[PDB]
Amino acid sequence: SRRRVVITGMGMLSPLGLDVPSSWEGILAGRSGIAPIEHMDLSAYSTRFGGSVKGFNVEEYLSAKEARKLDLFIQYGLAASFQAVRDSGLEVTDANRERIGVSMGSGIGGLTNIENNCRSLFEQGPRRISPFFVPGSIINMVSGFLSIHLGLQGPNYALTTAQTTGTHSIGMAARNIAYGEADVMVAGGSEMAACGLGLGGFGAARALSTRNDEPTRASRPWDRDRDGFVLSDGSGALVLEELEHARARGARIYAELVGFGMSGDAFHMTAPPEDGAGAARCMKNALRDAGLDPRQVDYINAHGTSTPAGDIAEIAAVKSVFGEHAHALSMSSTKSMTGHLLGAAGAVEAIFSVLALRDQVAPPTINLDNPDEGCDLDLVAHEAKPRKIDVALSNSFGFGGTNGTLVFRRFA
Amino acid sequence: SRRRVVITGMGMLSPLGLDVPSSWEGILAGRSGIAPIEHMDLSAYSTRFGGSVKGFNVEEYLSAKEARKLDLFIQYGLAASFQAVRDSGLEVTDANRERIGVSMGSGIGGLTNIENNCRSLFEQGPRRISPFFVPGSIINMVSGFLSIHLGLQGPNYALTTAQTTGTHSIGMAARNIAYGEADVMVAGGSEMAACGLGLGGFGAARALSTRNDEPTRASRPWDRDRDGFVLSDGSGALVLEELEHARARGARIYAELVGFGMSGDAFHMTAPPEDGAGAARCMKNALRDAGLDPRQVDYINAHGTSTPAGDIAEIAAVKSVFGEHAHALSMSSTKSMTGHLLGAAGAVEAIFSVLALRDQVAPPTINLDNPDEGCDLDLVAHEAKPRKIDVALSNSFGFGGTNGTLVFRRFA
Ligand SMILES: CN(CC(=O)O)C(=O)c1ccc(F)cc1
């Protein structure tokens, strides 16, 4: 019989701060983490701004010797994980290490390191490729390195489902616990795609906002004048724990994870369907999994990428799933402030949805100056909204028509 | 309590063949798929050979237009997937499309595409990066394209667990069906890394055999003269199906997937512990999941990569799990013939484990001329061994200490 799963620890790096509370204070103040990128010369690029992690000190977590071997996305995922585990108060023992696993994912993983080693190969030759090229760049090594540093011998894996990765990672980790394959999982995602290939690759697809003039105003989900997503870096990690296990050790419980939905659009490799049919199927799957009436949903943390087709598809999916109740819930895109952390987006947004439950506040959609046609829901324009939230939903949609929905509720 | 999961379709590209029966004929003949890599200047590389897919015709599967947009590893995964679905005879309908999903993964993903776009970026700047660079290179696009092409609306995701990916993808797909999240899944893995960054990256770590003078003898698991693994390309895919679903439509059933195990070594980034303690836990977990005693195992498809430390760790793990029955089971490494398909290794080896059951024959470990110290099990040296096989395991042990075991049984 299926066990209940609760959130006992959370950890983050985002464009708004180097931990959860600093990121969350920025979210509730309506602060933007988007700025011109300083780490490289981007005059040749149509987009020259993004959400960078500012002032990250990897030596808060790892020796300089080890850090040098690891792509930033792995450094970011370990930081978030180490925070989440510390925040949980869990002690790893011989009695429990086989029951604790990790599922930290990434959309693209070690693209900076792969580019750097590619430049070495092309300019010099294969003799100049780093010996750490593979273990320092491949996506499964957040889970790998985290298990090595903390002694976690439970299920050890990584998802890579593009912009859905962090939501899927958290959902399937919950399934592991629910079905008895583990008692604790560290789950979420990490991303640092801000290199020549990532900025150039998304730019070649004309997927990014090109508002270089006002980087902080570029991410404007459901605004009439949106022109694509803002590329952002960082990590989110959550400690998921079986309810009785958490109760038994006197753990602080943030919220319960009650529902998870997946669906494939089977529509298009990059475009969502205009009517959000895939998103609707996924949200209904998640609400049925949670045993809910759709009217119980109080807050939705939207995918809300600031893409013309993506944003309107989500309105359509929410109206389809919730009917008249769509006008009573609050829905916001924290990507208005953070930009789009890709494989990490679902991980930081899960955390923001849990904090919305803790603090009974809907985060704003900043930059929502002129809501587009049919975008007439409560999208929490401009300013945080204190309100009752018993049930919070976090949505992600990705390339390949992959959808994920997590349902969290307050724990009594 | 859980639904039963059977194999109804299989698909493959390997260094031995462009399908399952050609590959399996090569396996039972002890044929090698390893040869000097062509159409590439490997003068400056310490390893000049590997397991290429020979004569792949992508236009049997995709238009020229679609093929040009996708990395070889995505082409290979879709080829295996289409083969597997065709082999299953399954008919996708509006009635069943929400119950059919995909979990096709990769260890390292789009290195060829990343190389080619790096060349464009370094030589001409970012304006020459392909618009399709991102969707055409990310690991989840086998699941994505397959779901779009066949109209699959079930769970759509992709794992990336380095050399464990294929084993994990199949096991987790089996869980989706067992726990009623899907009735059908296409699962496995694909890889094309016997390319510049793959050979250069693994060669920098001195992980590869450098036996350039005798490429067919380089992969020699448990042989005293082994000097590292052989890099290989290809794909494997299985149609996994709920038993009553398969019976109702009169599907041909190859075997039953009865057990799945996962563990973490929590030991080292690339090397297993000398005693294979993590591999032991994983095999135990898989047998307990199947409700089977170690005495019931007849055949193990080893991970058996031809690394010094990895091969001996597996011997220690199997002696620990199976005690005196370790000498009565048969264990072989088909990597002696195929080399190491990394993320696809567990997919093609799951298929060889299924065909070991179908045909009642243990594939050989070729090149096992002088078994090393402690390597005194029935390693099916040199020649295929007809024998009774009721229960077959397939092991994968990957970077980050991530372990997977599948347990297959004859169906009746
Ligand atoms: C180079 N090192 C570090 C070390 O020996 O200490 C590795 O572990 C290693 C890296 C990649 C690989 F394919 C195999 C091995």
The span from the CA of B245 to the CA of B60, in Å, is 29
**Is A114 in CB contact (< 8 Å) with chain B?**
yes
Among A238, A259, A280, residue at a domain's last position:
A259
At B16, give phi and psi (nearest 5°). -100, -15
Question: Residue B395 pairs with which residues in a beta bridge?
Answer: B405
DSSP string, B279-295: HHHHHHHHHHHHT--GG
Beta A299-301 vs A330-332: how paired, if at all? parallel
Tokens of A331: 């829905």
Question: Residue A182 pairs with which residues in a beta bridge?
Answer: none
Return the residue of A nearest to B200 by Cα: A126
The span from the CA of B182 to the CA of A289, in Å, is 14
The span from the CA of A175 to the CA of B138, in Å, is 25
**Tokens 């939905």, residue?**
A261
What's at B88, amino acid-wise? S
Q: Is B207 a pocket residue for ligand 1 (Cβ < 6 Å)?
A: yes
| 8 A C-beta contact, residue B329 and residue B299 | yes
Q: What is the 3-state secondary structure (H, E, C) of chain B?
A: CCCCEEEEEEEEEECCECCHHHHHHHHHCCCCCCEECCCCCCCCCCCCEEECCCCCCHHHCCCHHHHHCCCHHHHHHHHHHHHHHHHHCCCCCCCCHHHEEEEEECCCCCHHHHHHHHHHHHHHCHHHCCCCCCCCCCCCHHHHHHHHHHCCCCCEECECCHHHHHHHHHHHHHHHHHCCCCCEEEEEEEECCCCHHHHHHHHHCCCECCCCCCHHHCCCCCECCCCCECEECEEEEEEEEEHHHHHHCCCCCCEEEEEEEEEECCCCCCCCCCCCHHHHHHHHHHHHHHCCCHHHCCEEECCCCCCHHHHHHHHHHHHHHHHHHHHCCEEECCHHHHCECHHHHHHHHHHHHHHHHHHCEECCECCCCCECCCCCCECCECCCEECCCCEEEEEEEEHHHEEEEEEEECCC
Distances, alpha carbon A254 to alpha carbons A261, A359, B123, B202, in Å = 21, 10, 51, 43
Helices and strands (H, E) in chain B, number of each type: 12, 14
**Tokens 């020229």, residue?**
B64
**Is A172 in CB contact (< 8 Å) with chain B?**
yes
The span from the CA of B174 to the CA of B182, in Å, is 9
Shared-domain flag, residues B216 and B90: yes
**Is A189 in CB contact (< 8 Å) with chain B?**
no
Question: Residue A42 pairs with which residues in a beta bridge?
Answer: none
Burial of B250 (0-12, 13-18, 19+ CB in 10 A): exposed
Residues of A in contact with B207 (CB under 8 A): 134
Beta B5-13 vs B234-242: how paired, if at all? antiparallel
The span from the CA of B272 to the CA of B266, in Å, is 9
Distances, alpha carbon A357 to alpha carbons A88, A374, B298, in Å = 18, 28, 53
Residue nearest to atom 11 of ligand 1 (CA): B205
DSSP string, B156-177: EE-B--GGGHHHHHHHHHHHHH
| 8 A C-beta contact, residue B220 and residue B367 | yes
Tokens of B390: 């009721």
Angle between helices A345-359 and A165-178 (to 10 degrees): 70
For residue B150, count other CB atoms closer than 10 A to its CB. Answer: 18
Among the listed residues A76, A61, A83, the one whose alpha carbon sits nearest the alpha carbon of residue A14: A76
Shared-domain flag, residues B191 and B264: no
Touching A: B residues 267-286, CB under 8 Å: 267-270, 278, 281
Return the residue of A nearest to B195 by Cα: A126
| 8 A C-beta contact, residue A326 and residue A318 | yes
Q: How far is the first Cα of chain B from the last one, in angstroms, to the nearest whole number?
A: 20
| 8 A C-beta contact, residue B185 and residue B5 | no
Shared-domain flag, residues B203 and B310: no
**Which spans in A132-183 are helix H?**
141-150, 165-178
| 8 A C-beta contact, residue A49 and residue A34 | yes
Classify A258 as helix, strand or coil.
strand
Tokens of B372: 């090393």
| 8 A C-beta contact, residue A337 and residue A350 | no
Preferred mutation among A153, A164, A169, A179 to probe B, highest tally of B CBs within 10 A: A153
Preferred mutation among B62, B99, B153 to probe A, highest tally of A CBs within 10 A: B153
Task: Kindly state whether residue B1 falls inside one of the protein's structural domains.
Answer: no
Task: Kindly state whether residue A162 falls inside one of the protein's structural domains.
Answer: yes
Residue contact B262–A114, C-beta within 8 A: no
How many Å separate Cα B54 from the centre of its chain? 18
Q: How far is the first Cα of chain A from the last one, in angstroms, to the nearest whole number?
A: 22
Helix (H) or strand (E) holding A132: none
| 8 A C-beta contact, residue A227 and residue A209 | yes
Residues with Cβ within 8 Å of residue B86, at least 6 apart in sequence: B9, B11
Question: Residue A381 pairs with which residues in a beta bridge?
Answer: A365
Burial of A271 (0-12, 13-18, 19+ CB in 10 A): middle
The span from the CA of A70 to the CA of A72, in Å, is 6
CA B271 to centroid of ligand 1, rounded, Å? 8
Q: For B191, which DSSP code? A: E
Shared-domain flag, residues A371 and A344: yes
Residue nearest to atom 8 of ligand 1 (CA): B270
Q: Is B202 a pocket residue for ligand 1 (Cβ < 6 Å)?
A: yes
Shared-domain flag, residues B386 and B291: yes
Task: Kindly state whether residue A241 falls inside one of the protein's structural domains.
Answer: yes
Residues of A in contact with B133 (CB under 8 A): 197, 200-201, 204-205
The span from the CA of A171 to the CA of A103, in Å, is 10
The span from the CA of B261 to the CA of B287, in Å, is 8
User: For the CA atoms of B93, A311, A194, B111, what is the dihedral angle to 10 degrees?
Assistant: 10
Q: For A361, which DSSP code? A: E
**Is A117 in CB contact (< 8 Å) with chain B?**
yes
How many Å separate Cα A307 from the centre of its chain? 17
Residue contact A144–B399, C-beta within 8 A: yes
User: For the CA atoms of B173, B175, B178, B179, what is the dihedral angle to 10 degrees?
Assistant: -120
**Which range of residues forms the domain containing residue B16?**
6-259
For residue A364, count other CB atoms closer than 10 A to its CB. Answer: 24
At A269, give phi and psi (nearest 5°). -70, -30
DSSP string, B47-86: --EEBPPPS--GGGTS-HHHHHTS-HHHHHHHHHHHHHHH
Task: Kindly state whether residue A1 falls inside one of the protein's structural domains.
Answer: no
The span from the CA of B366 to the CA of B347, in Å, is 20
Q: Domain tally for chain B?
A: 2
The span from the CA of A361 to the CA of A388, in Å, is 8
The span from the CA of A310 to the CA of A229, in Å, is 10
Method: X-ray
Task: Kindly state whether residue A175 falls inside one of the protein's structural domains.
Answer: yes
Q: For A232, which DSSP code? A: B
The span from the CA of B176 to the CA of A181, in Å, is 13
| 8 A C-beta contact, residue A228 and residue A337 | no
Give the gap in angstroms from C-alpha A287 to the nearest C-alpha of chain B. 14
Beta B49-50 vs B100-105: how paired, if at all? unpaired
Among the listed residues B78, B143, B136, the one whose alpha carbon sits nearest the alpha carbon of residue A205: B136
| 8 A C-beta contact, residue A281 and residue B98 | yes
DSSP string, B203-223: HHTT-B---TT-GGGT--TTB
The span from the CA of A347 to the CA of A170, in Å, is 7
The span from the CA of A298 to the CA of A304, in Å, is 17
Among A259, A291, A312, residue at a domain's last position:
A259
Among B199, B231, B259, residue at a domain's last position:
B259
Shared-domain flag, residues A215 and A269: no
Shared-domain flag, residues B301 and B323: yes
Residues with Cβ within 8 Å of residue A49, at least 6 apart in sequence: A34, A35, A36, A37, A212, A215, A218, A230
**Which value in Å is the resolution of this experimental model?**
1.6
Q: Is B229 a pocket residue for ligand 1 (Cβ < 6 Å)?
A: no
The span from the CA of B252 to the CA of B271, in Å, is 40
Shared-domain flag, residues A237 and A302: no
Q: Is A66 a pocket residue for ligand 1 (Cβ < 6 Å)?
A: no
Tokens of B331: 């264990």
What's at B373, amino acid-wise? E
Shared-domain flag, residues B37 and B60: yes
Return the residue of A nearest to B139 by Cα: A160
| 8 A C-beta contact, residue A395 and residue A347 | no
Preferred mutation among B62, B85, B103, B134 to probe A, highest tally of A CBs within 10 A: B134
The span from the CA of B132 to the CA of B117, in Å, is 10
CA-based radius of gyration for chain A = 20
CA-based radius of gyration for chain B = 20
At B69, give phi and psi (nearest 5°). -85, -10
Shared-domain flag, residues A273 and A370: yes
Shared-domain flag, residues B199 and B307: no
**Is B401 in CB contact (< 8 Å) with chain A?**
yes
Shared-domain flag, residues B250 and B163: yes
The span from the CA of A347 to the CA of A186, in Å, is 11
Question: Residue A156 pairs with which residues in a beta bridge?
Answer: A102
**Is B196 in CB contact (< 8 Å) with chain A?**
yes
For residue B212, count other CB atoms closer than 10 A to its CB. Answer: 14
Touching B: A residues 307-326, CB under 8 Å: none
Tokens of A269: 């490799």
How many Å separate Cα B366 from the centre of its chain? 18
Distances, alpha carbon A342 to alpha carbons A210, A400, B231, B319, in Å = 18, 14, 31, 44
| 8 A C-beta contact, residue B169 and residue B7 | no
